[PDB]
Curated annotation (Swiss-Prot):
Protein name: Host translation inhibitor nsp1
Role played: Inhibits host translation by associating with the open head conformation of the 40S subunit. The C-terminus binds to and obstructs ribosomal mRNA entry tunnel. Thereby inhibits antiviral response triggered by innate immunity or interferons. The nsp1-40S ribosome complex further induces an endonucleolytic cleavage near the 5'UTR of host mRNAs, targeting them for degradation. This inhibits the integrated stress response (ISR) in the infected cell by preventing EIF2S1/eIF2-alpha phosphorylation upstream of stress granule formation and depletes host G3BP1.
Originating species: Severe acute respiratory syndrome coronavirus 2 (2019-nCoV)
Domain CoV Nsp1 globular: 2-113
Record localization: Host cytoplasm
Residues of the full protein shown: 11 to 125 of 7096
Region of interest (Disordered), residue spans: 1-113
Amino acid sequence: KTHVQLSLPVLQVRDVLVRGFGDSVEEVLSEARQHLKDGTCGLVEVEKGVLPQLEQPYVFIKRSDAAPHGHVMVELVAELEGIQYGRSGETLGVLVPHVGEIPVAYRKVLLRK
């Protein structure tokens, strides 16, 4: 199916054990598409002093369409040394590996896949 409905846990930053997905953008955009379809992908909301606490290259999720079934449209976007690769709308947060972290909140989305 072109698209897919998912429900990412929102994790508090101070408990993310694995603080990112890789060392090359190509690699964070692959472990991260992968821990998704396996339901092992969390989401940290961006606020101040959050993004210093996570390993680059960052994988964002960003609104790509102002929303079927109450699930937003998003696509991945990697960020490394100021350059975003991929083009997209509103940062809904950054994707990290969830490995047990108790959430505070789920976020429905819809993945161009």
